[PDB]
Every structure is written in C-alpha cells, then in structure tokens.
Amino acid sequence: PVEVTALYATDGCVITSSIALLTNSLLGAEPVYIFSYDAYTHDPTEQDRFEESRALYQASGGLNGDSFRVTFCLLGTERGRTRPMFVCRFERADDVAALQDALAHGTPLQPDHIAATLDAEATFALHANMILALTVAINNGQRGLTTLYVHHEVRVLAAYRRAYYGSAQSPFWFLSKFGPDEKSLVLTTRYYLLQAQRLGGAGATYDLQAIKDICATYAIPHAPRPDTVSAASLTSFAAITRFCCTSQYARGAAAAGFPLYVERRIAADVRETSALEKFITHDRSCLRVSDREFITYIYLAHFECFSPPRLATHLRAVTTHDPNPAASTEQPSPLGREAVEQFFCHVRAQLGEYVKHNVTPRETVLDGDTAKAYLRARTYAP
Amino acid sequence: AFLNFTSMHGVQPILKRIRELSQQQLDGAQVPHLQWFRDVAALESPAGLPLREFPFAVYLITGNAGSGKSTCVQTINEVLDCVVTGATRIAAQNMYAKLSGAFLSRPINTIFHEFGFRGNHVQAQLGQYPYTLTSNPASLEDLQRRDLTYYWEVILDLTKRALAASRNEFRALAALERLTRLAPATHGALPAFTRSNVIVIDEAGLLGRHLLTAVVYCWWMINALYHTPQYAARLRPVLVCVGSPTQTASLESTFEHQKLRCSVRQSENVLTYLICNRTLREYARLSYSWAIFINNKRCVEHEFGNLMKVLEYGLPITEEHMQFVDRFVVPENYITNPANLPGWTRLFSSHKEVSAYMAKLHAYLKVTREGEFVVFTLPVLTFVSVKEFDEYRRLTHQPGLTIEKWLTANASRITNYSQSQDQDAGHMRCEVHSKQQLVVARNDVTYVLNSQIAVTARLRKLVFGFSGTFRAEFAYRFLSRLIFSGAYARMGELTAEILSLDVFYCHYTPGEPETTAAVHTQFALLKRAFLGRFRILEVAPFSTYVDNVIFRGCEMLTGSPRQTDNYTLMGYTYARVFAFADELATANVAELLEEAPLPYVVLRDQHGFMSVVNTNISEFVESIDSTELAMAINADYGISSKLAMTITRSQGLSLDKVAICFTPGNLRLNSAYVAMSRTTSSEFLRMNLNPLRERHERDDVISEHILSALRDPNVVIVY
Amino acid sequence: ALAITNIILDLDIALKEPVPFRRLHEALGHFRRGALAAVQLLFPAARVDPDAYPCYFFKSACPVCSCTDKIGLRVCMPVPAPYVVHGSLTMRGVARVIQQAVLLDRDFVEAIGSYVKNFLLIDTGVYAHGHSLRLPYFAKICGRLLPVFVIPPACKDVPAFVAAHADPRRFHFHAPPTSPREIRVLHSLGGDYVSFFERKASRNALEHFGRRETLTEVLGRYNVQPTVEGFASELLGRIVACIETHFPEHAGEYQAVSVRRAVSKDDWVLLQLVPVLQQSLSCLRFKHGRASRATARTFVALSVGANNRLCVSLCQQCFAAKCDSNRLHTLFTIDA
DNA sequence: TTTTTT
Numbered sequence A: 001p002v003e004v005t006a007l008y009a010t011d012g013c014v015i016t017s018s019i020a021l022l023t024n025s026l027l028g029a030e031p032v033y034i035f036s037y038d039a040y041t042h043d044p045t046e047q048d049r050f051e052e053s054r055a056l057y058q059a060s061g062g063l064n065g066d067s068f069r070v071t072f073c074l075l076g077t078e079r080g081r082t083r084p085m086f087v088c089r090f091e092r093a094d095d096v097a098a099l100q101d102a103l104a105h106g107t108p109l110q111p112d113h114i115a116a117t118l119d120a121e122a123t124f125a126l127h128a129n130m131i132l133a134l135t136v137a138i139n140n141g142q143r144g145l146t147t148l149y150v151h152h153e154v155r156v157l158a159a160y161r162r163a164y165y166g167s168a169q170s171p172f173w174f175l176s177k178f179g180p181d182e183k184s185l186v187l188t189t190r191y192y193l194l195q196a197q198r199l200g201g202a203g204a205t206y207d208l209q210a211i212k213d214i215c216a217t218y219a220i221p222h223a224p225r226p227d228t229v230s231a232a233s234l235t236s237f238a239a240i241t242r243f244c245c246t247s248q249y250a251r252g253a254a255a256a257g258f259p260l261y262v263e264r265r266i267a268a269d270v271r272e273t274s275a276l277e278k279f280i281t282h283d284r285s286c287l288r289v290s291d292r293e294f295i296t297y298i299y300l301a302h303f304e305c306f307s308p309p310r311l312a313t314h315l316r317a318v319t320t321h322d323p324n325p326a327a328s329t330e331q332p333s334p335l336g337r338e339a340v341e342q343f344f345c346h347v348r349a350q351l352g353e354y355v356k357h358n359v360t361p362r363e364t365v366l367d368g369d370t371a372k373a374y375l376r377a378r379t380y381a382p
Numbered sequence B: 001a002f003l004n005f006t007s008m009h010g011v012q013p014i015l016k017r018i019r020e021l022s023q024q025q026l027d028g029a030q031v032p033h034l035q036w037f038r039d040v041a042a043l044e045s046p047a048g049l050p051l052r053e054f055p056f057a058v059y060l061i062t063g064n065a066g067s068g069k070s071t072c073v074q075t076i077n078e079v080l081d082c083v084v085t086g087a088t089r090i091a092a093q094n095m096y097a098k099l100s101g102a103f104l105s106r107p108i109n110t111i112f113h114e115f116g117f118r119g120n121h122v123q124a125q126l127g128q129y130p131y132t133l134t135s136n137p138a139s140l141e142d143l144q145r146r147d148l149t150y151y152w153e154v155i156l157d158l159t160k161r162a163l164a165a166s167r168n169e170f171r172a173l174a175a176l177e178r179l180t181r182l183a184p185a186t187h188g189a190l191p192a193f194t195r196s197n198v199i200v201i202d203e204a205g206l207l208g209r210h211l212l213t214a215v216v217y218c219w220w221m222i223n224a225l226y227h228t229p230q231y232a233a234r235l236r237p238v239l240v241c242v243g244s245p246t247q248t249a250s251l252e253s254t255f256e257h258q259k260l261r262c263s264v265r266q267s268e269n270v271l272t273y274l275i276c277n278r279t280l281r282e283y284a285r286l287s288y289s290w291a292i293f294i295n296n297k298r299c300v301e302h303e304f305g306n307l308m309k310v311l312e313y314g315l316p317i318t319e320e321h322m323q324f325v326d327r328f329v330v331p332e333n334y335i336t337n338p339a340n341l342p343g344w345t346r347l348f349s350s351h352k353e354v355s356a357y358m359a360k361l362h363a364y365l366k367v368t369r370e371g372e373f374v375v376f377t378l379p380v381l382t383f384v385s386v387k388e389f390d391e392y393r394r395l396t397h398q399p400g401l402t403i404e405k406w407l408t409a410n411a412s413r414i415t416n417y418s419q420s421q422d423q424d425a426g427h428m429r430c431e432v433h434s435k436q437q438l439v440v441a442r443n444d445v446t447y448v449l450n451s452q453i454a455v456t457a458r459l460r461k462l463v464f465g466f467s468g469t470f471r472a473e474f475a476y477r478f479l480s481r482l483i484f485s486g487a488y489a490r491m492g493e494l495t496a497e498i499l500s501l502d503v504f505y506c507h508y509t510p511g512e513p514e515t516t517a518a519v520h521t522q523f524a525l526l527k528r529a530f531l532g533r534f535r536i537l538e539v540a541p542f543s544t545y546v547d548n549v550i551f552r553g554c555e556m557l558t559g560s561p562r563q564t565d566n567y568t569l570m571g572y573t574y575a576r577v578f579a580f581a582d583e584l585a586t587a588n589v590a591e592l593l594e595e596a597p598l599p600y601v602v603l604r605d606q607h608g609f610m611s612v613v614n615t616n617i618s619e620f621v622e623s624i625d626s627t628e629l630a631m632a633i634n635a636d637y638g639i640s641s642k643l644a645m646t647i648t649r650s651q652g653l654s655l656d657k658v659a660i661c662f663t664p665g666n667l668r669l670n671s672a673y674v675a676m677s678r679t680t681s682s683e684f685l686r687m688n689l690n691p692l693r694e695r696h697e698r699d700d701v702i703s704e705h706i707l708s709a710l711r712d713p714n715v716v717i718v719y
Numbered sequence C: 001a002l003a004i005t006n007i008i009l010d011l012d013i014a015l016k017e018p019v020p021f022r023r024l025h026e027a028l029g030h031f032r033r034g035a036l037a038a039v040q041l042l043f044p045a046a047r048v049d050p051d052a053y054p055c056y057f058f059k060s061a062c063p064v065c066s067c068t069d070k071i072g073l074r075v076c077m078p079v080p081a082p083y084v085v086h087g088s089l090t091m092r093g094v095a096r097v098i099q100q101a102v103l104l105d106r107d108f109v110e111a112i113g114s115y116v117k118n119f120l121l122i123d124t125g126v127y128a129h130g131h132s133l134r135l136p137y138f139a140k141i142c143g144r145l146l147p148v149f150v151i152p153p154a155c156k157d158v159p160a161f162v163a164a165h166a167d168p169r170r171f172h173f174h175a176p177p178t179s180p181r182e183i184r185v186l187h188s189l190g191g192d193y194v195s196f197f198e199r200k201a202s203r204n205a206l207e208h209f210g211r212r213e214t215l216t217e218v219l220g221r222y223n224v225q226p227t228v229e230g231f232a233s234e235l236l237g238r239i240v241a242c243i244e245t246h247f248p249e250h251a252g253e254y255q256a257v258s259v260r261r262a263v264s265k266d267d268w269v270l271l272q273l274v275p276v277l278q279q280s281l282s283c284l285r286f287k288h289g290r291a292s293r294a295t296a297r298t299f300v301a302l303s304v305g306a307n308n309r310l311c312v313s314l315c316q317q318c319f320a321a322k323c324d325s326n327r328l329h330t331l332f333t334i335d336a
Numbered sequence D: 001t002t003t004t005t006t
C-alpha cells in the first residue's frame, strides 16, 4: 500500500500523450519517464520518521512495499506546485517488477504496463469534473473522455494545458531552475514539488531559491559518480531521469534526512531571527531619537545582526554532515547571542548611562585671577 | 547565497498576512451587486452617480530601487494565488524577467490591460467633471466617487462595453447541480481578474490615485457579470502595491483645444494616496499592512549610500554631504560637449534640452567623421485628413488654424511622447495628396549607426541571421541555418570527423534541414563539430544569415523579403515583408505605404541576432465636443537612443553611467535624488552643479510618512 | 567669542489638540526633574539638588491654552557653579543630552505624550554664531513670551523665584555669572558622532568598507606639511587650463592670482583667490552686467575623495540676487 | 520641466 507521488515528462507534448493514454488509444503514447518521486505510507517523532523513511527508500535501490499506488503528476496549479493526472495500482509481480526497474534505474515505463493498470475507479474520477465542464462549455467516463476528444480537440487541449499549466516546459528548464548540482536536481525537485505541501510545515510557504539554499547547506558527504557523468551532460529527459534514479541522493539516508533538515534549519533560523526582530521592533518603537540618528540606528542594527560575516557563521552552524537526526553535526547558532551581547544589551542599558557613554567631556580648570579674567572677558559686562 | 537570507525569512510574515487579507469574507449586503453596474451604465453624467462603497484591501510593499522588493513578489507568485501586473510595459517585462528566472510566471501584462483599457481610451478626457467633496472627514464613498468622476470617460466606457456585450460564462457552470474552479480553464480567453483576488501592481507609484479606486471598481465588475466563485464566496480585492514612494511620480496631461497649450501637472500616485490619506490609512489599516524593504544592494560605496539615505528619508543636508557631492561637479560645457563622457547617458530637465543635445551629438559624430557611428537619415511620416481638421477646427470655436500650427504641439500627442519630443528631426513637410482623401506629411529622423538603442512601442521582430562572434526547436533550425554558411590538417583531423585544404571546405550538404527530425539529426553533429575544431583554433564576427545581405552605406541588401531587450541599430533594409504588412483610414494609408516603400529598421539584440522590425502607427482622437474621431495616424519607427533622456523618464529604468544637467531655479531635490540614484556606483556619475549647494525646493511630506512608518511596531521592515 | 552661562532651550511643542494648563504645568515639573538629572550628569562636580535648583519657564501666548499650532516654550537654567560652558557645539551637546534625558522620565511622556505629535522638543540650531533667539517678555511679528511658574518642590524662597524671571541675566546666553575660587570651562562634549549609534556605525564602516585617509595624510603624500599654498600654486595652472577651455567667456581673469588660505576644516581647505588690487573676479556663472558680474569671490577647495585621491574644486561666492547670496557654490572638481 | 496606458 506504499503511495508514490511521481512527476513525469514524455518526449514531446506530455498532455496529448497522457490524454491518449487515458483514452486507451494507440495513436500517441510515448513511454513515460519518471524523474522525481515521494513514497509514503499512512501513519511519529523525528527519528521515527527518519527510520520509517530510511526503510521506505531501499539503500540497494527501489522501494520496500509489495503493492504500490502511484499517483503521477505534472507541474500544475489547482497554490499547489504539481497536479495529478492518472493513478495506477501495482499489485501483480510483473507490475512491481516494472515499477522497481523504472524507479531505481530510470528505464521508461512502456504504455502497456501503465495502460493495463489504470485505477479506473479513481483515475477517470480525478478529471471527471473537467470532463463535465468541457461538456457544458462545448455544448454552448472513459467513453465520455473519448467523445469529448473527438468533438472539439482544440478546447480539450486548451483546457488540459490551462489546468496543469506548466505541463512539460523543457528538459533544460528543470536543469536550470532546480540547481546545477545533482543534490539540487534530485532532492530539491523532490521537496519543492512532491514533498513540500504534502508534509506541510513552514517549507510549504518557501520559494524555490530558498529551498535550493537549504539544499546547499544540506552538505552531506559526496561520493563520486560511478559513471563520472556530469550534471551538465544531460540533454533529454532520458538523461535527467537516469541521473536522478541511479543517484545516491535519492534512495537512502539523504533522501530521508532532507525533509527533516528543511524543518530543522527553518526552526533554528526563525528562533534567532524572530528574537532579533523582537529586539528590533521594540527598540524602534521606544527609541524617541532624532530622525538622522533613528536611521543610523535602524541600519546599524540590521547590519549588526544580519551582516555577511555573522550570516556566514550562522549558516556554517546549521550545515549538516549527516542526515540522521540523532547523529547530526549541526550545532547551536551564535547569531542572536552575539548580536545581543554587543549591540542590543548595551542599547537597552543606555536606555542616563547614555550620557556616560556619549559625553567625551573637556572641562579646563582655571583658578585664581584667571577665573575673574575669563568671566569679564567672555561674559556681558556687569 | 547568504544574500537572499533576510528576504527569505522576512517575506514569510508578508505572506502570512496577504493570505488572511485575501481570505476575508464580506457581509452579504456589502458586496457590490450587478444592478449597481447596470445603473452606472444608465447614468450619463457622473453627478447623479449614487454614493457606493466598493470594498477592497491593500498591502504596501515599499522601498528604494535595488531594495529587492522583487524577491517579495517572487515569493508571493509561487505560494499565493495572484495576478501580477505592472504600471508600465517596461516594468511588467522586468517583473516577467525576474519571475521566469525562478519559476513559471504567466505572461505579465499591465494593469490597464487587466481592467480592459483599449486603444480609444488612450486619448480620453480624463479630468473634466468637477466634484465638491462632502467631506472633511472624507468618507471612502466620496473618495471613490471622486476617482470615478475623474475617470468617467473611462469607467463609463468600460462598464458599457462589459455590460452591453450581452449569461453563460461561470453562470452556466455554477448550476452544475442547480465546478467554477475549472471554469477559467475550460472557458478560455476569460479576464484574468476572474480567477484571483490578490492583484500585485509593481511600480504602482507610476499610477495616479484615480486608478486605485478604478482597479477595485473594475475588479467587482468582472466578478459580477461572470458571477465568479470568488463573488459567491464574498471575497474582496487586495491590492499588493509594490513601488518606490520617493523615487516615482505620476503626472496628468491636459490639452486645451484653443490655446493649444498642453500642460502637465503633478498628481497623487497610488502609493502617496494610500500612505497620506487618513481615510485610506484607516480603512485599509496600513499600519498592519505595510512592508518596507530597507537595503540597497547595488551600493558598494558608504558615502554614496549615506547620501541616498539622507535624500530618501528627508534628513538634514549637512556640510559633509555638500563636500561629498562636490567631487562630481563638472562644467556645463563639459557634459553638453559630445566629445566628453562617451557612452554616458545624459539627463536633462527639459525635452527641448534633449532635442538640442542630440542634434549637437549628431553634428559631432558627423563632422569628426567617426566611423563608429555613421550618422544616417531615415524617413518618418504623418497622415492627417482634411475632414478631421475641418470638423475639429469647426468645433474648437476657432475655424482658423494652420496645419503646421496643428502640428505645433499635437506632434507630441500623436504618438509615444518620449521619443516624439526627444528626437532631432527635419520639418514635417506636408503636401495635399487627396488621393485616398488625406493630407500626407513627411520628414526624416536622424539616428546614429550601431548604437545601443531601445524599442519604445510594441514591435514585431523577424530574426534574419546571427551577427555574433565565433565565441558563441525553431531556434535549432536557425542554428542549422547558421551552420549552413559554415594545424591546417591537425584541426582538420577533427574536421574530418565532422565530414563523416580545409576538410570542411571539401564536400558539404545543405546545413539546415527542413523537417524537425532531420534538424535534430544534424543538430548534435554541428554542436560537437565547433567544440572540437574551434578548441584548437575567435574575435571575428561569424556573420551568417538566411539570405545574403550587402550593407551598402546603411541600407542593407537582403534580397529575399521573407521593449526591455537592449537592441543595436544596424541599418534600414527595405525588403518589403508581408509579415509587417498586416495593414487592413488605415487602408487609405496602407495604399500609400504600398506606394512609398516603407523602410524597416534593423536591430541587433544582445546575443547578436539581426532582426527586422515593423513600423509604428498611432492615432490622435481628443476633442472637446465629446466626439472622439480618428484624426491623424503617425507612421514612424519608435526607437530611442538611450544616450540622452529626461529625468522624469529616467525614473522608469536604471542606467549604467550618468551625467546630469541641472537647470538652476527649477531644482527639486526629488529630481536630484531620482537622477543620482539611477546608477549603481557613485564613481561613474557626473553632474552640472551641486544640487545640495544650490537653492532646491524640497518636498519632504511623504518622507516623514515613511519615517513614521519605520517608527511603527506593526510595519514589517525587511533588510 | 563669549562664554555661555545659561542653558537656554527653545522647546517647540507640536499639538494634536488644545491642552489643559494643569497638564502642561505638571509636564513642566517633570521636565524640570529630567533636565536637572541631565545637568547633574553633564556637570559632575556641581551640586544640583533637584528640588531647589531654579529652572525658569516661559510660554508663548497662543485657563484654556488656545493652541492650534504650537506651545512655544523657553527653558532657562543657570549653569551650575563652578562651571561655564564655552562653544556652540558644547551647548548643542548639552541640548541633546537634555532632550534625550527628558524623553526618559516616564512622568513627562505619560503627561504630554498623548498630545505631542512629534516627540522632538528641543531645537539645537539656535546656538550657532550669528543665530538669534527670541527673548522672553517679547513678541513675534503673535505671542508675547510670558513666564509660567513651576516652583521647585523644596524652594525656600518663592518670592525670589518669582522675581527671578524678571532679571535679564536669567535668560541671556552670555550673561554675567551670578568671589570665584575655581572655574571649570566645559568647552567640548566630543561632537555630532559621539552617539553610541554613530561610534558603532563608524567602526563598522572601517571593518566592512575600508579606511578613508584624512585630508592631512593624503596631502602629506604630495609633499605638503600644513605650505598648502605650495601645492595650490601648481594647482592653479591646471584649474586655469580647465576654465579657459570649459568656461572661456571669462578667461583672462585668473592669470595672476595668489592663493590666500581662508578656511581650514580637517577635511576641507578653502583658499581664496584674490588678485593683485580690489578688482573683483567676475562670477563664472549666471552672466550679469559689467558691475554686477564683477562682484564675486573665488576659492579653491582641497578635499579627500574617491579612492583616497586629493580632489581639487573651484568654488565661488557671488554677491548678486540670481545666485544664492553669500552661499558657496562649486563649479568643477579636478583630480590631483 | 514633467511620462503613460493600446
């Protein structure tokens, strides 16, 4: 019963090929190529989740279940980053043999394997409302889909391209927008698309650049690639899929630690930032200083807390060297404590110590006739 | 990698506020009904128009240019439902560039397109009817009625066009069992305001206050006729206005039809309207709905950043600032002399000044015979009609007016103003060719050769070749066309591999295949080819085009006829293409365009691909008798030099190197701040005088408002 | 030139709405408390008992304080013995200390806080040389400054305190101090950049951006030990070459001039360029008549700029209406 | 002085 969320992209227009697959028509059906997948079982602590996930993603390759319900998806919006297209059951020995082969290596899944395994009880149920809306619109399940395919092709294609808006963009687009590194290309594509919204958490509201930065600081050990294939030597999806499936950031500890590390990093970062912004907002609200010195404080404080050196130390304090949460090498961050130690506690104190800190006084002592002299010389006459 | 960190973790509170601002259901009675917009159509004058509140929300994202406000928009687009718009086409394309550089963003259009602005609305009397606000305190209803009376000649036309179009649409689907979410997909070409309630307007300070209400008003329109699911959910628009409040202004132009004196007054932009109006700052609750981005990234200079801080925040001008900006002052005759500061954009505070300087620059580049820019002459025409200037002269209460006196000022109001009043040109000579019932006029506009020019209006590029150096699916076809035009044996050893006495110069087959499959067959081949032979042995331009070109003088000899992008002026080939000849009034001038060969100017993009473009045609329709009729259509090229411009237009786009020419007496510190902030580095900045040392009219009213916003616990500051 | 003996602060209060007099008098008592704390902090060897030290208050006429614009206040404090304050900047610093000390006492902010739109009360620009301050018992050409009596909590002579507001010495900057053995002259309080925010920001600037060497050090590279006329000599030729190319309509005017050192700030050396005798140098800009144009002065300004390179500027001071009268303007800055 | 929307 292991459930897999899979993102695929055929050779050409994936929408037309997918619709033809749903209609069981042998006209256009490019073997489908899966490139990113999230496997989960209905349920947890952080280490309980890590053990469950490490069990899920078999280190040798593939998954560990006997029957697999796989929900294929495309880049689309319903704000969801993907959109499901068709769901397939895999209970027979031949079905799971094809799924393990296509999930651990990357060999495309032929139309036969999928077409013989559509969960018609649910597959055509996912897009049934789209069928109804198309019927109503053109007026002004699978037999209905075929009939609507025949009647007005242009509107069917336009509807299936507006929904699932991104569909297939380009092989090069994925290598462009999901980092040049293999770590990014596998892990960030898994999280930002098929793992962010499902698992919830703060990462659901974070952007692609932020998630790529988090992946960059997820610096797990890097073993060399057995075929020494470079990440930029990829042209079609048969290369990206092969790179991702036979990668060692995809079938084990790293694939299990990334979702937990996203949550951990954000929690540590917000703990320090939110503390620093509490201090910032309070001091801003109660400053009562001149306009120029106010701007000087606000810029100075934002620098003194969020300067490039302080930020570098903080990001090196959250960088991991292992995905196991109980064996993590991340250590407490010095950002807020250092910022409070130098700038903030001292400003809270000056809030008549302010005079002692900012007085630099020069009082020259003149005793004798020189006092009388200085008086008449520098004061209005008696 | 650490640069994004502050934005990444500070945009989240912004995102966690826009969501509740967009998911707040209104009371049933407060929702503007369809009958409201039905009555608006019935109303003729904007006087009996009933006081009607149109609910809306705002979230203000403000800051210096280079703040990074674009990162906030990026995060919003990928997380929230939103319709991203722009105040100018350039700003919309800039946002598209910066949103498609991270993920997918649908084609970003202007807010004007979103609320239905069309061609005839461009020259419309937008300031006619009066209003004595029954106000102080000004009710929101009164403010909205003022902004609708301001735009009566636009709101009324939009309402009439939307209403009298008829009803199907969502009304149909909603009754599936009596699925509107899948309605915009199945029923296409539907307005984009029917699928979201978060409207992001970038550089919204370029829009006047009249637009704010207008947008909200229009929103409700497009959600009432179509009976959108958001209208059934009783949601209300939230306008995320992103822009710089102290580096951007909006101006209103009115043309008096007897004095022929086109005047341009200053106006209250959306940002200033929202920040400085006590009624809007309370209804919209700007305190809990304001984000100021505070960091200027492209500033590696401490003193320059300090100067930007004092100018933007209205801080007192001290002696030290005067001494710092003293190091930029260079004489008046040094900036204006074309021999100095080559490649530096020069800003003036008058369109006449730019028209003088460009002519002087052309004189310099012609007399000193600089082969870098072979100055050339190119025709631009105009087409007035006898009936138009007969009836309009009749209606202006003055039937005596010469055509040249008609073109005394309406030349600006006949096309894109920016280049129209900032171009050196000959006298627009006209003779009476009443063959197609027209008065034709013709002159020529002098450009420079091979300069980084910019496209002003919307043009249709037709790529003909690639004029780039050896360094380097239809794009793959064009690359195949390039290869079609593609030691002595050692690089030849790898050349014989391409072959499958230069080995490439022995035998060949047409480089560009026709079918896509054959193109891909020959694609990997040519891709590996250059990598191998060129590796051994790159500055000479690999000039390769689909057709042989001969640039005699400036016009090229392509035999076969068949805005943000920084293009390069190349030459005026004629090679009449039917692609640009989509001519269908317009046909009366189409016949003359067939008669007189229309020159198509050729431009070179950043990559180096040569592109032949179409011309531009624009109408003048304004009148006083409420009779908008097509008077005159102006056929010209619509290209800008990017070498000299006005300070006011400089607000829109950032510049590399800047020399500012300041006119004394007209010194406004906001103009100085805008002019000085267009360049990243203070090193490459020269100026006429010192704006800090001379008498300057400073208007520090919005500055204190930002300062009080920076002094509020509920305003989110992002570093 | 003279020594300041009374702390005279100009309190410009902004109002959201009209105020009751009792609230104002209580706020003034709180202001007295805060100012006396600030004074005992600034002058540490004095003895300011904050229940007997006389502070004097004057309000501008605008009972019901019919104030629609501002409550014009003037606060006069005797400088405690044996101190005397010298310098415009020293009293500027005293004013900043008092201002940031009165917005610390919770009583003052609790009393007047709901009324003051901008919490800034003290103006610090009325202490420069040549700047005037309206005396109490005088009007404006709209409000005769009249005393408002805030008696010290433990004042042992009330009639004396009342008949102390009428003595001009109590409200004059350089009044005679009212048998002196010792006298301590507070003549410097650091400067504008001694605020912790200013001192921290300056230190962060050096760490992150770099050191901007002072004018003297930069000039020392070009064999100048401040002598400045020594470099100004050779600089005159370059400046004249610049003007007789870019500004030629007055060319033959600075052929023979002698640099006269006039103003010396540690980052700004201004040398006048008077010729040989009273022939004035025609103003380079804003072309005037024969006599009007020849009513201007010229200066040369050496400063440090860019990547620590000595920047030389030509500047003018014109005596005509078209140019800012008696204000210094810049024309070109050249490298050296 | 003063741009911009199709």
Ligand SMILES: Cc1nc(N(C)C(=O)Cc2ccc(-c3ccccn3)cc2)sc1S(N)(=O)=O
Residues within 6 Å of the ligand: A296, A299, A300, A301, A303, B064, B065, B294, B295, B296, B297, B299, B305, B306, B307, B308, B309, B310, B312, C200, C201, C202, C204, C205, C206, C208, C209
């Ligand atoms: C040592 C230092 N470097 C600091 N940086 C990186 C900055 O100012 C960066 C900056 C500079 C200018 C602006 C701006 C932008 C528009 C209008 C006014 N201003 C914003 C941000 S701040 C300090 S500090 N506060 O320690 O002295």
Ligand SMILES: [Zn+2]
Residues within 6 Å of the ligand: C283, C284, C285, C286, C296, C317, C318, C319, C320, C323
């Ligand atoms: Zn002068």
